[PDB]
Amino acid sequence: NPFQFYLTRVSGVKPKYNSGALHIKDILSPLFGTLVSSAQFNYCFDVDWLVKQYPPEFRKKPILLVHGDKREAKAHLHAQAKPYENISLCQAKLDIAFGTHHTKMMLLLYEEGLRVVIHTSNLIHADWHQKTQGIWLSPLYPRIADGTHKSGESPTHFKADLISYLMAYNAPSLKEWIDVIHKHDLSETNVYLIGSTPGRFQGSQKDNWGHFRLKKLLKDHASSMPNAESWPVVGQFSSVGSLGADESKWLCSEFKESMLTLGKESSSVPLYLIYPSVENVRTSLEGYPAGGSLPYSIQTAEKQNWLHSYFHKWSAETSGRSNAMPHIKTYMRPSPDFSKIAWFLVTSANLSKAAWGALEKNGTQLMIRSYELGVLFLPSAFGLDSFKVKQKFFAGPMATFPVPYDLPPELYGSKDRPWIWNIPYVKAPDTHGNMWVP
């Protein structure tokens, strides 16, 4: 397969549903490369657990943790890391209020080359145990010979774009990794980088990040088709921000507008949002504790009941993962019969203005609060007009894209409710025999 898109291993499904899945121990294995140094970009870390996932022979190689923690949280993380003299830390600046460092990425420097891993899991045991999570694995990028002058750039501009993303941190530890990337040949990369960084972007910078970045890529590198207004948009996420008093405030005015872009020319496009119901969580492998990683608060939700008519259940029979709650985030553009897709994005970005950006100053400025990162699969980058949807995620021509959940998405039933993490559920017990009392 050309896509190199994987799910994490799920404990408790039959082996047929983990053949081709990856655990973090698989990613860090010597079989992937002889580790010299690594950077772990993430949100939450269990440092003791994390070091154990590296092969024993590699556990003293340098590790950089890139995080966004402040004040006591920052102290707690440093205290976690203090016992390991090989671990350095980089605090990503979050100069806009309510921002988060959500990006989940491994930079893996080997004897043999460099690998980039963009994924959706926190570096804690529970995020790799029984959740649905996504991974993109880059090729092994060879080093450019010293004295040789070549760009090492791909047709998707991934090398420059990754360096640009790292430069936004303004961090000395990441300038070191920028210099590493400069020295490697990333020309085989067939995905486009879509990042968010905190800031207020106007003019020549508005298209660099967030949903304007997606819009720019779709305008430049996808083609519109006849009956494009019939191709739905699907968004799939593990949390929702405050979107406004109605759909015209942000969801359907600028977010949907960016996602329905195709091609360079000048809406009733169906929008499907996939988000676990209470029943999805209750009957999940984890039970109600899965809802600790689906942090939709009642304060947010009661301000936007209009949103929930868009919500569809989590269902993933195709990957045996209907009971493995999603912490992956994905966005895609299926055909009206869901048999093809015009593009697929896997990312850290949830359904929120903080993650995707919101227009300010009379539409001239895109304001983003958070760090996010994902990769975009476009048919043109593979010599194709569209992707055929793989019918069974783990089944057997390799030019079909492995969508990890079921299509078409299934609307919430009248008795379903979106999972809301900070109210109690005491009506029916979960798969472990417990209720939810936050």
Ligand X SMILES: O=C(O)c1cccc(O)c1C(=O)O
Catalytic position from the list 101, 129, 221, 327: 327
- Tell me if 407 sits within 8 A of 338, measured CB to CB: yes
Q: Examine the residue annotation and report whether 23 is marked as an active-site residue of this protein.
A: no
**Is residue 239 at the binding interface for ligand X, with CB under 6 A as the rule?**
yes
Give the separation between CA 257 and CA 126, rounded to whole angstroms: 35
Q: Total residues contacting ligand X (rule CB under 6 A)?
A: 9
CA–CA distance, 277 with 285 (Å, rounded to integer): 14
Dist. CA 410–CA 236, nearest whole Å: 12
Q: What is the DSSP letter of 123?
A: B
Rule CB under 6 A: is residue 370 a binding residue for ligand X?
A: no
Q: Looking at beta carbons only, is 238 or 386 nearer to ligand X?
A: 238
Residues shown for the chain: 438
Between residues 69 and 254, which has the closer beta carbon with respect to ligand X?
69
> Closer CB to ligand X, residue 40 or residue 122?
122
Nearer to ligand X (CB atom), residue 101 or residue 184? 101
Nearer to ligand X, 101 or 159 (CB): 101
Q: Which of 295, 382, 410, 417 binds ligand X (CB under 6 A)?
A: 295
Per-residue binding string, ligand X, 10-49, x by CB under 6 A, is: ---------------------------------x------
Contact pattern for ligand X over residues 375 through 394, marking x by CB under 6 A: --------------------
Nearer to ligand X, 156 or 196 (CB): 196
Q: How far is the CB of 338 from ligand X (least distance, A)?
A: 25
Q: 313 near 410, Cβ under 8 Å?
A: yes
Per CB under 6 A, which of residues 400..419 are in contact with ligand X?
Answer: none
Residue 139 makes contact with ligand X by CB under 6 A: no
130 binds ligand X (CB under 6 A): no
Q: Does 236 bind ligand X (CB under 6 A)?
A: no
Residue 270 makes contact with ligand X by CB under 6 A: no
Q: Angle of helix 172-182 relative to helix 158-167, nearest 10 degrees? A: 170
- Do the bridges between strand 63-67 and strand 87-91 make them parallel or antiparallel, or are there none, so unpaired? parallel
- 356 closest CA partner among 346, 365, 345, 366: 366
Closest CA relative to residue 327, chosen from 38, 39, 43, 30: 43
Q: Which residues are within 8 A (CB) of 276 and not within 5 positions of it... i.e. 6 or more apart?
A: 238, 284, 290, 294, 313, 314, 325, 326, 418, 419
Please tell me which residue in 101, 102, 211, 312 is annotated as part of the active site: 102
Tell me the closest approach of the beta carbon of residue 109 to ligand X, in angstroms.
24
In three-state secondary structure terms, 38 is strand
The count of C-alpha atoms lying within 13 angstroms of the C-alpha of 4, restricted to the half-sphere facing its C-beta, is: 19
Is residue 122 part of the contact set for ligand X (CB under 6 A)? yes
The verdict on whether residue 388 carries a ligand-binding annotation is no
What is the CB-side half-sphere exposure of residue 203 using CA atoms within 13 A? 1
Closest distance to ligand X from the beta carbon of 291 (Å):
11
Q: Residue from 38, 197, 208, 238 that binds ligand X (CB under 6 A)?
A: 238
Nearest approach in angstroms of CB 120 to ligand X is 7
Q: How far is the CB of 121 from ligand X (least distance, A)?
A: 8
* Single-letter code of the amino acid located at 261: T
367 HSE (CA, 13 A, CB side): 13
User: Residue 266 in 3-state DSSP?
Assistant: coil
Flag whether 313 is marked binding: no
- Residue 238 beta carbon to ligand X: minimum distance, rounded to whole angstroms: 4
Torsions phi, psi of 254, nearest 5? -115, -40
Respond yes or no: is residue 327 known to be catalytic.
Answer: yes
Any contact of residue 102 with ligand X (CB under 6 A)?
yes
Contact 321, 17 (CB under 8 A): yes
Residue in this structure with the two tokens 């379903």, named with its chain if needed: 416
Binding status of residue 350 toward ligand X by CB under 6 A: yes
Q: Which residue in the shown chain puts its C-beta closest to ligand X?
A: 239
Show which residues are catalytic: 102, 327
Q: Which residues lie near ligand X (CB under 6 A)?
A: 43, 100, 102, 122, 238-239, 295, 327, 350
Output the known binding site for substrate: 104, 329
Output the known binding site: 104, 329
